[PDB]
Nucleic acid binder design. Sequence first.
RNA 1: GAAGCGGCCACACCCGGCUGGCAACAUCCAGCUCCACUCCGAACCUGGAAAUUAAGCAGUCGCGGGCCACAUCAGUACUGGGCUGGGCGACUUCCCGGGAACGUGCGGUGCUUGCUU
Length: 175
Amino acid sequence: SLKQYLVIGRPYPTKEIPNPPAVRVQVFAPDEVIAKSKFWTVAQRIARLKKAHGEVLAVKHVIEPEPTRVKNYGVWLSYRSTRNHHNVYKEYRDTTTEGAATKMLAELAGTHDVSADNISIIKIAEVADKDLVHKNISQFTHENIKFPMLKQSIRAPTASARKVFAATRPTVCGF
RNA sequence: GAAGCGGCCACACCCGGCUGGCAACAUCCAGCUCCACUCCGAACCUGGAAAUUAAGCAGUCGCGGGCCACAUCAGUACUGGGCUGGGCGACUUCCCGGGAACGUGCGGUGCUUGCUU
């Protein structure tokens, strides 16, 4: 699964300019090798720094201070569809920044039908309950939340104990 | 510094100003022979040296035209590989590589080969 990464890179020393500016990029990738390639894509596209003349100094893996508790996450992104580019601010409720970013790649591929090639994120950050403005996620920050589990599952409690017959009929009611 | 002989052949060209002539280059003065104008000593040619730096030439100036140089322009345009990627199609995301031009910004405007007073 995706892991947040911070990558810092720089161009090689020329004799004209030793110690140039380095540059960092936040990237989301399954491992350290992919995170380099996402850095070289963003560095080339914007800051004009190529693979063929540049170091890459530190792939830092961002682990969470606490994954124990739930946070809100605003995600400002652009996504591209044929004939136009759209800017969207979408937000999510999750244990971590990565799990929010993994959610929206599924949600955009679901709802809008665009892949991670076309998508380009601007900003992820955690956000307080006061500044949060979207109604369907604001309801989970309130107190006294009840919802029932209408439609129970029929699965095996362990994969040994599955069966394709039954005497009694299963009840799939919420209760 | 000036002159003959040249090398790379505009950072040297083209328009217009200003400052210099000790010798040197030149304008300039004259026309008899050499010879010269399909007419003309204007040119070419020959013999001068009175007076000038006005012109050529030399140096220098211009928010000058052009030329040259670096940086931006731009990781743009285009492009070599790869996908049972997308798309009715036309075309085009993405992955591994290469990478312009015009324009604009600031700078510059000849550097010296061998012989001679």
